[model samples]
Target: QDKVECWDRFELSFKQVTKGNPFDIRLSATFVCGKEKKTVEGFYDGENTYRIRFMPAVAGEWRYVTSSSIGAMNGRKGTFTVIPAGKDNHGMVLVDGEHNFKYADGTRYYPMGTTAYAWTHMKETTQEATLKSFGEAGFNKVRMCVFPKNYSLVKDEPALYPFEIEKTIKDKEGNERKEWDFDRFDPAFFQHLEKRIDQLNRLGIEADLILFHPYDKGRWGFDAMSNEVNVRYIKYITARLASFRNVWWSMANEWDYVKAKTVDDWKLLTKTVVENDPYRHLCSIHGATATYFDYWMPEFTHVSIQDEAPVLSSTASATLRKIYRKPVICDEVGYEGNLPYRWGRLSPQQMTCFILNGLLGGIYVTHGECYQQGNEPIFWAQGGSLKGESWKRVKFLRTIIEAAPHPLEMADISRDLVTSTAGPDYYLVNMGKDVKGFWTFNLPVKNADYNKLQKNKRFKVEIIDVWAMTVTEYPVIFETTEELDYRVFDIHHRGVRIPDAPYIVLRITEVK
Candidate 1:
């Protein structure tokens, strides 16, 4: 291509006839633009094809040269022009404040994410259906797996395996046992993943790719590859995918659950990713329920947690932020399901409460639904249309969050229930605990500054029924009293009236 957009993938390929293991062939390209230089590894696609990809960081003329062990593929050089990024391309997500995220171009990024572990491994028609659901779900991020999972209710083999299958032998149970050549990869398998990742980018979503997961359980044996094989796999996949701007690296889904791997093994893998990925996209590792991987590791960009106790708690969020000193994401507290399992049984109101609790606690949460309908696909495992009530409510919360000008922060003066703030001009009250007929509007005044609250200014208070998807603006106007003056608007004496509904949200915006 003559011209490529900045932060967009720029690729080149060479078709060569070879004999030995294709994946072991050494191929690399060094891109040079002025004084900036980057050396990116190349991977062998199927059918004697070697491809290299690069994402130009700046808009200018860049040149690159290829070095390969293959005689015909070596000493190749080319040049390409990089234009400005497209309107929808904000570049990759970055770590902004100690507790927030932003785009590379300085736009605030709210991590409203969802999870569908094996969605990509489903049928093609089913795949499109999942993408459709994502488009309507209004989420900006998704947690998907790089390798196909072998978990419950999803025992079907994938259309293509990551590694090439050499032969198959029938077991005593009349099942065929496939022999895989781990040294050779089926490039189409990764190519399919790239297409999906690119599609997610086009739809304004970040693809959080899980590298290794414990769901395999020896079925595929991908979870138990040796260190050498594992490192090679990481390098090859990163070389293939690091250029895509919307990609994020999650080392594993539940790092602690994999008994075959140790902490030292994880450290080596983490180091490989940090050195390999040029873009340095957001990297994290999700732990089991109680166990936590060290977010304090220099390689980790944020704290990806799995604790339900911190959801929508006033002290927990602050403590976690203090402990980790980075953004906290409650990726898997629980799910909205009815499968008779502990992790798969939360009502709509209960699920919504979990999400609201995270937001009010000054953190981000990821939603996953697992409603069962017999042999049909479940939303969480194999993505299709959403069947639960929490998704719509979750999307509603996203709208409310994005409407504010700044990232939400934990507000002071919230007694039993919590209140979060974007700035002095905006407030979100969590009425989850205080679901009485009315709530006392007693604002906290100790550690926060309400610059917009004054004698000349008033608040446009609105009662939000999150479950009902209703926002009724009230004219209760918060005017200052003589004693406290503009310090706070304490209407705690009479309070405001509303229905005794669960998961109620109160929005307070400053108005002149």
Candidate 2:
């Protein structure tokens, strides 16, 4: 019995349909598992390979019939049994609670992301090292590009090219440009990207695939792909990648960075992605400088940003949520390193503040590094081993967010202070609550009442040192006569003493 697990890819390929320009061929298949049915498109994978892949949404017997404009692939049919997904398979993530994400299996997802622009284009050993770094650093999401980067730091050419090289011609400047047959896609390249994506699935990481980026800067001509070829490319790549559970579609890293593309161009491409990608995984678009994309587009599922001031601001994330009314992620606050560029020269403390502040403001954060180890490639560019302190702190922050009942929200707009409320009575206050270390609160209740303080409502008050990754509980509990001063003394009324430190957070949880 041909059985595929629920939410797992069921792929079928045909050698006969490879004739003609298969990229232009109208080939697709309709799968029916109970009432759940999807007509997934088919695409060519090069060298006499034509494939249609489907991810069954339900557990049952599903049958599909392939139809094509050409007679070679029409009327092809098959049946497969869909079984329960593996324990590690939690289904694709969904936009939950209007400002948060959660797996279909009901696990709240906190997106602790990292960027590695060209990890797959690197050598196998280097790619392995990047994988190892992801596992060790404990990032749940990674920003990767489909095309190879052409920046100064990424000096090596990719081993795998997306299209076949018809011939090499010298450009006006004398640089040899490979004339690409945009009509044909090299399947080997896609298969390799799929392999890496599957590997990330094994590590429980989401691959935020940056479908297009301007890092190539017209050197590869991928960023300059015209609308017709671009739409075709989108269909082909969507057919291959949409079935992967860990896969997400980032329309472009920076639509503004690529000079050749217009707002209309992005709209067309994004719409193509949505129409072709049947699963509709989390889709977002980022931008260059202060120029943000129209994340409010119906095709856009969430907001991905690169701004520094917003992440540092106490209210940007929450404000963004109120505006767009969707989840927001600071994909590029900046990198943590001492590179000559200001973008890559953030101190560790600065990086940590970015991470925490973004999260505290009810958004998400992505970590990146630009440190060079003895002239080695930058981690953010080439992705060979993490070389920064901020990654560890990022991991620590994720753990803290997970430990409490999640889907935390920054409820107010207090300057120099942000408090994230998780569950009914869990409050996490940021950095020396009111100017200094001492914080006096009226218990953050419906009405200011110390008479209701039963040893602070039987709560556990602890001071969290974010960078140090240590928690010190306040020893004096109101379980003793400390409750006696609740009403009588205003100085000691509902107060938690936090150290006068930069990265300190006060946690107040009602002990269950």
Candidate 3:
């Protein structure tokens, strides 16, 4: 508190997921630069922009009295401490929801999402347990559906037009009125949303919002009217949410579910979001897994491909990356199980493989785990999921992924690595498409003759390139003739070795 001071009234900006990489100044001010030798010297970037990267590397107990600039004055002054020094990785390569999802950071974001039937019906009473468990199980993001009519319906009931309007004024003596109208551009809902966001923020998780969705499924009702009413919705929400730091926007999740809108309507929706929002956050559509995104390519950020049964759909992954030209986050990536309770847990082995393979491939994964209200409104979860050994299992899976050296991009498996059975721990790594990589089986387990690694003996491991069924050696970093007496020693494969799994994962950069 002594090292820093408040320069301006304490306020934070929320990020707009659909927008480009930028943020807003909800509470702009001036503050004395932290104890960095000389007095704080600064200038206001603009009324909307505030480039306050001044706090160099100080944490714990800072007294910053609103930043005051000796230079030409444009605003107020003072500053405060949220956390301390580098605790908030605000400007890192901002991904969709979680903080470190780029794959190489060794952190993994396995989405355990629950799709709410209606937006306004979301209550903490119903979600507290799930939220806690999910975070414990290494899940970080939840896809939240913000339905329009449910809160502030633009049609039918115009009385509810100013649905989220809160009465607030600059002065305490002034009478409070409908200052914000959710039907139009108003920040009133922000007050309520702040509470919700604060809870998720405490849990260290993020929420995904589906903008421009309909109130009803039928045509010519709420869904049809949404096109016209929701045109400015993206831009308006993006600018306002520039203050919210933890949120993701689905440009359109099955946007076409609404009828009678021209293709341009969808484009306009996505364009407004990307152009206005400042967070450079990831966006995606809840598109069907059965069909490709040819009809709606230029209208979104990322692709959220959903299949009824992921195991049955082999081509979905290839189609998502190849055609979408963006990272593919599997929206519903598992089979809808037919057990009495859809909460039948995934076997630890299956969950481990799912997390590893998905991260290794660099694909965003959202798996449905629990069915809350029968099969009708079922959802996969990460919130409050640390029940039994599954929590430890999640942590183990997360650690393995955090150790991955590259982003999950699609890699074609080499012919040698594409075997159903493993003769040894070595397998060729390839992007089933064309790229090449490898995962060699060289984990040091306690038991000598347990798996691939020879017992009580050391063997030299090397990478061999395979072309047209011919093998040639490629220089890689595999330890040679090392002792093996451990639970599992990770053999850091630097683009060499044979992969044991059928699918070869690689990072493919495609620009469309």
The TM-score leader among the candidates is: 1
Global lDDT of each candidate: 0.83, 0.81, 0.41
For model 3, state the Cα shift of residue 192 in Å: 2.9
Candidate 1 lDDT score at position 230:
91
TM-score on alpha carbons, each prediction: 0.95, 0.92, 0.54
lDDT of candidate 1 over 259-322, digit per residue (tens)? 8899999999999998999889899999888678878988999988777888747557656776
Using lDDT, give the best candidate's number: 1
Question: In model 3, which runs have C-alpha deviations exceeding 4 angstroms?
Answer: 1-85, 88-120, 148-189, 218-222, 226-228, 260-262, 294-301, 308-325, 335-357, 372-395, 408-512
Deviation of model 3 at 81, angstroms: 10
Worst 10 residues of 3 by lDDT: 414-423
Error of 2 at 383 (Å): 0.1
- Tens digit of per-residue lDDT, candidate 3, span 242-337: 434456777555666555555577677777676664335566666545534543454444557654333232233433445545556666544233
Please identify which of the two predictions, 1 or 2, would achieve the higher TM-score against the true structure: 1
Alpha-carbon shift of residue 334 in model 1 (angstroms) = 0.6
Off by over 4 Å in 1: 172-174, 312-314, 413-417, 447-456, 481-487, 491-494
Q: Write down the worst ten-residue block by lDDT for model 1.
A: 446-455
lDDT for predicted candidate 3 compared with the true structure? 0.41
RMSD (Å) of each candidate, 1 decimal: 2.2, 3.5, 13.5
TM-score of model number 1 = 0.95
